[PDB]
Write a protein that binds this ligand. Structure first.
Ligand SMILES: Nc1ncnc2c1ncn2[C@@H]1O[C@H](COP(=O)(O)OP(=O)(O)O)[C@@H](O)[C@H]1O
Ligand SMILES: Nc1ncnc2c1ncn2[C@@H]1O[C@H](COP(=O)(O)OP(=O)(O)O)[C@@H](O)[C@H]1O
Ligand code: BEF
Ligand code: BEF
Ligand SMILES: [Mg+2]
Ligand SMILES: [Mg+2]
Lengths: 621, 671
């Protein structure tokens, strides 16, 4: 039944020889040049990072005055990229051991400055991605040493000679290959600096002009950032022209080190873009997330930045193609954002209402597409509704509903209608008012779908009014009519009428019934799973028609079936249609307009009238 | 104002030494085992790739120096000891090859083997390894690695290391032909001694590896790489099954494209379009190379608008990043994306011919993707490529029938080069557009674009076929004028115009709109109601406005609402139902009493030309008019009034004023 081959069979014979690992240097160089970094442009990042590190080491040495800066120069005529830093520079032994040895990083021995970027000992070789020839001039700041020129074609060997006129620091000259002339373009080189190296701690000059490098706001003390600095920084990170309506500046080292700023734009989101967002950093250097989480999909409306020292970097930079503790970070961020937004609702409900109006669709999306019930409920805390127990216009929440529920109660009742007036005057609400439960009023298009997917909240089942009305037939229909029996059809009249209606609506309705639960309305359509039926139509519903035998229209229909039978049927058809529309279960309303106009004319029938008459006498002469 | 210190101030002084690049072996091992891959689980991919390569070399040897051995990769987990073991029955390694290949970073025996083959040999395209580092991925997850290997030539060996710069080699007995690798897993990596976990990783990366893969004596990879087979030797049921696997889906593909080509690059690929339409409540095309997963969500190979496709793309010669989970930046990959874009467009176009019906359903479901593509791309040539897939309706065609921009370009009058469209919520609002009524009479055909984002699509399209798209953008004569003047006051802030028109027939009124752009924002407004003065409800409305003003208010409101519905401008009439019910009950049951006034001669025939006033008991003139040879209607409320003749026509005597009373019961008396 099983096919295995692996067995404990092997035994060592005699002694072992010991060996050291070695390297195929030529092929390592090729790997760094062609196979290590997925984008050619990052040689700029790597060289700037090296210059920044050389400057940090000098700064640190300076404590134990001169300028500390990084210069870039593009010669589009000579096809040349030059970078020069005023840092510690390198001696002969340093040029040989650090530059000449792959995976050797002098920026490690440096152990006494979380400012140091360099780690791997390969970044420098990225120059050979874009250059036939690389020359290095370095002057190890120190009374002893002289200058040096380091030189290589990138294959196999390199040569070093003593040099004069070498300024303190290091200059590196890239003779660009014809493939890569784009990096002798000033506009091109500028694009790259501001992409990866825009938060570097020393000034960078490009062809004599100082680049507008920035402060890493996310690393700084939240209380020291003014609203205006956030406005500006938002515009930078979101590449936007408006300002944030909310700003969340979150630091933690709790489960994981986190330094982050999130913004909600003041603009409403584009509906085009919704169907068609935060940057990830470490050590002030950009790190890529294409095809990665950081935030869950429903929080893609947020803009801003996340930095976490617990995220390891691969040898290139990207990495972000993971699920480890990213999934954790994402869960932490989601929780914190929900808490932030709940707090904004407390502070300023009216402002939150505007937020919810503009961004609520993201919450609904999040509830609908999550499989995790606890997450659905967390996000659900952000939803807002009106209530039958609160004045019109006043927003409430599932939490506040829960806190008004009497000790006995175990369900949350809701009603979805286009607006406050229609909900308040809904036949489904009239029926519910005979009970003493609070009803949530939900006015937005996908609120019902949302609550259907939510299903329950804090162990309380969500039930639509329409559903609850149906369920009550299968319990005690112990409800009394709104009007005394004198204002209703007698039983004999009700039965006679119903039997007529059943014949007139044979294959349109499952059954027809009187209900004591209506007041203003002549009838209503009921369906057990009303919400799901409404949802299905967005592309027969064993519907029940329930009539109010106290309503003027119903009573008139009773008469009409024996006086103008054809008019009675037209009326009946219209009452059903009106109940289907009120139920939200109506197909195209256009084909009913014909009947309605016809009905309207036949209903509306002048009379006879009283005449006052004046005679004009003729004059004589 | 500039600051530069870069100057040619250096000079080469004296002689120079030549030095060879070196390599810090210790640190480099750490880099592979720590800082190379996004996930630790990837050591399983690498070791299986190596077993596949070993097997492939053995298979190649036996073509020529034939012999008889089964070709298999075996994995074993031990959850008590915390070990992961992989064994292949491939070509194995002698002592020299263990020291050379395993002991030297970036040395690849498999690469050398590849370089010596005829490019035509099958092993040329199935050997995976290139870099000579994949093996060091074991130290990511293992404190100790043991390799037992027995070459196919004329002694077994055990290679052993902790991964800290040294390794040991000793002779070993009992080693089976091939190679066995035993990982003693780190404490934080013990999950790879779990069978279920290892199974997840094997199926993720290595499910299509050419050789049988066993785990704890059970076979895993039962899935053959359909994209490498001849399109003709694959059945519809194989596609359905493969689709479901590769898309993780449960429906069938509505469309299947099996594309092979050796052109800009080796391509073996299969694309599917799902049968199920997508929505809000919510995999991609995967990238492979030599049957191994590179990216579950391929990024650079397709344009974003084709993200609705599922399936797989495999290329043997696509340039891989060292991590094997990315592609290098490449002009070849750019060309590939362009080629695929064109192939899929070509395929969908062909499908619109073979079955326009089916393609019509496809365009309804996925058309938004095409519209997005046209808006987001910057190449005019490609915009017009994707635009060949668009369907609209036309002014020159019946309702509900689709046409392409090409078919429009077909029918155009010989002396013209302009594409006229009109983006409307619906057909009614289109056919009755002022701007379109222009193009009806003198000019000719207009595209009707009802779908959302149809507008900015064409705006972004700009130009198609070297041509330019441009948006083309009873009751008497005084009874009616009276009615109109009343209507403008009850609907003061609902419409910006009220007209009278002779169409309608069955319809008492219709809504028309000038700007379609507005109407969208409205259901995203300045309507124009137009009245049929021959319609019974309108003539009823006319009569009730004075007689039963409150009833005529409901009726008016209803006629307006009914017209907005008939124009598709109000899709959810819930706001009107309570009112409509009031209208019905009141219609089936006025306060003002109808009073008809006759001015006559001595024979009792109606007399024109008399100036008349009606005044109330206070003396106030309520109304002044001239008799015109027919009866005059008034509607008065309870009180006392007087009809006064203020001028008689020439040759007639002025009659005595007539005083009358209307009471609360609607009965009238002359006093
Ligand atoms: N501009 C510079 N000035 C001084 N030292 C430098 C400079 N650039 C590189 N180095 C030295 O060379 C080493 C190698 O650089 P690189 O290959 O990028 O590795 P790292 O990851 O250490 O930065 C560094 O560790 C540093 O000691
Ligand atoms: N299971 C095996 N059987 C025989 N040879 C192997 C096996 N695994 C690895 N090798 C040899 O070791 C070399 C190093 O493997 P690896 O570091 O993955 O580099 P590569 O990219 O060449 O596969 C291979 O080129 C191959 O010659
Ligand atoms: F700049 Be080093 F390679 F991290
Ligand atoms: F498996 Be090798 F490093 F490509
Ligand atoms: Mg560096
Ligand atoms: Mg390998």
């Amino acid at each position: 039944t099983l096919h295995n081959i692996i067995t404990d069979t092997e035994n060592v014979q005699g002694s072992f020889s010991k060996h050291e690992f070695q390297a195929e240097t030529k092929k390592l160089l090729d790997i760094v040049a062609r196979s290590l970094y997925s984008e050619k442009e990052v040689f700029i990042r790597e060289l700037i990072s090296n210059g920044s590190d050389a400057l940090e080491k000098l700064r640190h040495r300076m404590i134990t005055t001169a300028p500390m800066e990084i210069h870039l120069q593009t010669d589009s005529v000579k096809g040349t990229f030059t970078i020069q830093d005023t840092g510690v520079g390198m001696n002969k032994e340093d040029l040989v051991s650090n530059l000449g040895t792959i995976a050797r990083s002098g920026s490690k021995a440096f152990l006494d400055s979380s400012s140091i970027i360099g780690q791997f000992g390969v970044g420098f070789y990225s120059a050979f991605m874009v250059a036939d020839k690389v020359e290095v001039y370095s002057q190890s700041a120190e009374a002893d040493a002289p200058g040096y020129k380091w030189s290589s074609d990138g294959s196999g060997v390199f040569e070093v000679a003593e040099a004069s006129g070498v300024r303190q620091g290091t200059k590196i000259v890239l003779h660009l290959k014809d493939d890569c002339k784009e990096f002798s373009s000033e506009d091109r080189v500028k694009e790259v600096v501001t992409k990866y190296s825009n938060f570097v701690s020393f000034p960078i000059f490009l062809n004599g002009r100082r680049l507008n490098t920035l402060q890493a706001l996310w690393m700084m003390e939240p209380k020291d950032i003014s609203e205006w600095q956030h406005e500006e920084f938002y515009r930078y990170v979101a590449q936007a022209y408006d300002k944030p309506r909310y700003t969340l500046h979150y630091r933690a080292d709790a489960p994981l080190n986190i330094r982050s700023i999130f913004y909600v734009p003041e603009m409403k989101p584009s509906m085009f873009d919704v169907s068609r967002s935060v940057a990830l950093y470490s050590r002030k250097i950009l790190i890529q997330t294409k095809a990665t989480d950081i935030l869950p999909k429903w929080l893609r409306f947020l803009r801003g930045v996340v930095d976490s020292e617990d995220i390891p970097l691969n040898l290139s930079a990207e990495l972000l193609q993971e699920s480890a503790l990213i999934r954790k970070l994402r869960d932490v961020l989601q929780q914190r954002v929900i808490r932030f937004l709940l707090d904004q609702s407390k502070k300023d409900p009216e402002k939150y209402a505007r937020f919810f109006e503009d961004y609520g669709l993201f919450m609904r999306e999040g509830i609908v597409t999550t499989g995790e019930q606890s997450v659905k409920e967390d996000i659900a805390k952000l939803l807002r509704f009106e209530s039958s127990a609160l004045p019109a216009g006043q927003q409430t929440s599932l939490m506040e509903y829960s806190s008004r529920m009497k000790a006995g109660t175990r369900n949350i009742y809701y009603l979805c209608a286009p607006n406050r007036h229609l909900a308040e005057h809904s036949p489904y609400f009239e029926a519910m008012k005979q009970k003493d439960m609070e009803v949530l009023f939900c006015f937005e298009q996908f609120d019902e779908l949302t609550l259907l997917h939510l299903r329950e909240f804090d162990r309380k089942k969500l039930i639509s009014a329409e559903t609850d009305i149906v369920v009550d037939h299968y319990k005690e229909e112990k409800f009394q009519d709104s009007k005394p029996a004198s204002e209703r059809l007698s039983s004999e009249q009700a039965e006679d009428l119903l039997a007529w209606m059943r014949n007139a609506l044979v294959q349109r309705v499952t059954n027809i019934k009187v209900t004591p639960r209506l007041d203003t309305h002549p009838a209503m359509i009921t369906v057990l799973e009303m919400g799901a039926a409404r949802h299905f139509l967005r592309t027969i519903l064993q519907p029940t028609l329930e009539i109010n035998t106290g309503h003027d229209l119903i009573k008139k229909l009773h008469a009409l079936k024996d006086s103008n039978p054809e008019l009675a049927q037209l009326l009946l058809e219209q009452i059903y249609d009106n109940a289907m529309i009120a139920a939200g279960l109506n197909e195209d309303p256009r084909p009913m307009i014909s009947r309605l106009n016809q009905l309207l004319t036949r209903a509306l029938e002048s009379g006879s009238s009283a005449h006052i008459v004046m005679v004009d006498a003729y004059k004589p002469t």
